[PDB]
Motif scaffolding. Structure first.
Motif, PDB file in Angstrom:
ATOM      1  N   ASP A   1       3.884  -3.415   5.039  1.00  0.00           N
ATOM      2  CA  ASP A   1       3.618  -2.114   4.435  1.00  0.00           C
ATOM      3  C   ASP A   1       4.836  -1.604   3.675  1.00  0.00           C
ATOM      4  O   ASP A   1       4.710  -1.089   2.559  1.00  0.00           O
ATOM      5  CB  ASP A   1       3.200  -1.111   5.509  1.00  0.00           C
ATOM      6  N   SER A   2       6.024  -1.737   4.268  1.00  0.00           N
ATOM      7  CA  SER A   2       7.249  -1.361   3.575  1.00  0.00           C
ATOM      8  C   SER A   2       7.484  -2.207   2.332  1.00  0.00           C
ATOM      9  O   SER A   2       7.900  -1.670   1.300  1.00  0.00           O
ATOM     10  CB  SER A   2       8.446  -1.482   4.518  1.00  0.00           C
ATOM     11  N   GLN A   3       7.232  -3.516   2.409  1.00  0.00           N
ATOM     12  CA  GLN A   3       7.349  -4.360   1.224  1.00  0.00           C
ATOM     13  C   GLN A   3       6.423  -3.875   0.117  1.00  0.00           C
ATOM     14  O   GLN A   3       6.758  -3.976  -1.068  1.00  0.00           O
ATOM     15  CB  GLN A   3       7.035  -5.813   1.582  1.00  0.00           C
ATOM     16  N   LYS A   4       5.253  -3.353   0.486  1.00  0.00           N
ATOM     17  CA  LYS A   4       4.311  -2.777  -0.474  1.00  0.00           C
ATOM     18  C   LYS A   4       3.823  -3.816  -1.481  1.00  0.00           C
ATOM     19  O   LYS A   4       3.248  -3.470  -2.515  1.00  0.00           O
ATOM     20  CB  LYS A   4       4.931  -1.588  -1.213  1.00  0.00           C
ATOM     21  N   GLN A   5       4.044  -5.095  -1.187  1.00  0.00           N
ATOM     22  CA  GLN A   5       3.639  -6.178  -2.069  1.00  0.00           C
ATOM     23  C   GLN A   5       2.286  -6.758  -1.673  1.00  0.00           C
ATOM     24  O   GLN A   5       1.825  -7.715  -2.302  1.00  0.00           O
ATOM     25  CB  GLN A   5       4.721  -7.268  -2.072  1.00  0.00           C
ATOM     26  N   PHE A   6       1.640  -6.192  -0.654  1.00  0.00           N
ATOM     27  CA  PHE A   6       0.309  -6.589  -0.221  1.00  0.00           C
ATOM     28  C   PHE A   6      -0.546  -5.345  -0.035  1.00  0.00           C
ATOM     29  O   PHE A   6      -0.036  -4.237   0.147  1.00  0.00           O
ATOM     30  CB  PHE A   6       0.347  -7.380   1.095  1.00  0.00           C
ATOM     31  N   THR A   7      -1.860  -5.539  -0.083  1.00  0.00           N
ATOM     32  CA  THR A   7      -2.803  -4.475   0.223  1.00  0.00           C
ATOM     33  C   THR A   7      -3.138  -4.486   1.712  1.00  0.00           C
ATOM     34  O   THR A   7      -2.742  -5.386   2.456  1.00  0.00           O
ATOM     35  CB  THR A   7      -4.083  -4.622  -0.603  1.00  0.00           C
ATOM     36  N   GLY A   8      -3.869  -3.462   2.143  1.00  0.00           N
ATOM     37  CA  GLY A   8      -4.239  -3.330   3.532  1.00  0.00           C
ATOM     38  C   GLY A   8      -5.102  -4.477   4.020  1.00  0.00           C
ATOM     39  O   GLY A   8      -4.818  -5.107   5.045  1.00  0.00           O
ATOM     40  N   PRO A   9      -6.194  -4.758   3.304  1.00  0.00           N
ATOM     41  CA  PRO A   9      -7.026  -5.916   3.675  1.00  0.00           C
ATOM     42  C   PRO A   9      -6.264  -7.230   3.653  1.00  0.00           C
ATOM     43  O   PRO A   9      -6.492  -8.098   4.504  1.00  0.00           O
ATOM     44  CB  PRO A   9      -8.147  -5.876   2.630  1.00  0.00           C
ATOM     45  N   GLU A  10      -5.351  -7.397   2.692  1.00  0.00           N
ATOM     46  CA  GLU A  10      -4.563  -8.623   2.634  1.00  0.00           C
ATOM     47  C   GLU A  10      -3.643  -8.736   3.843  1.00  0.00           C
ATOM     48  O   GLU A  10      -3.472  -9.825   4.403  1.00  0.00           O
ATOM     49  CB  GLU A  10      -3.759  -8.661   1.336  1.00  0.00           C
ATOM     50  N   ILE A  11      -3.044  -7.621   4.261  1.00  0.00           N
ATOM     51  CA  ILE A  11      -2.194  -7.638   5.448  1.00  0.00           C
ATOM     52  C   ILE A  11      -3.022  -7.945   6.687  1.00  0.00           C
ATOM     53  O   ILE A  11      -2.574  -8.662   7.588  1.00  0.00           O
ATOM     54  CB  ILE A  11      -1.441  -6.302   5.587  1.00  0.00           C
TER      55      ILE A  11
END
Lengths: 145, 48
Positions: A82-92
């Motif tokens: 989440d901090s990286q912000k390089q992925f979306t919620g579903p992707e995480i």
């Protein structure tokens, strides 16, 4: 993935000897557009796992890693992504599902990052070759962009 | 090596026009390399 590589090799053999704006190249682009969603899913698979390999080596991710064993809890993994912000919620969520956490909810970050790098390298390279070939032999086509 | 001295100084861009280079760098590299660590490197105060 090996079967995918074979199929992409077949497509490249079809593209063999193709002129710019060739009929077979245009047909291949049309087929890709018809199967757009699945092509996008495959590209997302490759992109997510390459980006994961990149992130796990990141200093911020290493900071979020605190266990002396070197593992990271599921919650810490989610917060780091989440901090990286390089992925979306579903992707995480998908990455967490694939993480293969133990009963203690601890993820081996190195193994998780390195799991799919070697198996998916051949198909990834072949897909890159196919996309580059189609792009260069069909320059003015917005769909391929 | 010598340029490391000026990074965290309050008056880094004294002659250079871009007085927001510190914040631009924080925004660009704040996610991968860490916002707090970038702020420490560039002598920045996030609350400020």
């Amino acid at each position: 993935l090996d079967l995918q590589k074979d199929m992409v090799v077949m497509l490249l053999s079809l593209l063999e000897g193709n002129v710019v704006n060739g009929m077979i190249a245009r047909q291949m682009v049309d087929m890709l557009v018809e199967s757009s969603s699945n092509v996008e899913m495959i590209l997302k698979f490759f992109d997510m796992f390459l980006k994961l390999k990149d992130i796990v080596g990141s200093e911020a991710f290493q900071d979020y890693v605190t266990d002396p064993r070197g593992l990271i809890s599921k919650k810490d993994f989610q917060k780091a992504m989440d901090s990286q912000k390089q992925f979306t919620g579903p992707e995480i969520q998908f990455l967490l599902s694939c993480s293969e956490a133990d009963e203690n909810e601890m993820i081996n970050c190195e193994e998780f990052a390195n799991r799919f790098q070697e198996p998916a390298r051949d198909i990834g390279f072949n897909v890159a070759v196919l996309l580059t070939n189609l792009s260069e032999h069909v320059p003015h086509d917005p769909r391929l962009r | 090596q010598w340029d490391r001295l000026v990074l965290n100084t309050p008056s880094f861009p004294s002659n250079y026009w871009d007085k927001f280079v510190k914040r631009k760098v924080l925004d660009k590299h704040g996610d991968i390399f860490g916002r707090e660590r970038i702020a420490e490197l560039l002598g920045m105060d996030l609350a400020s």
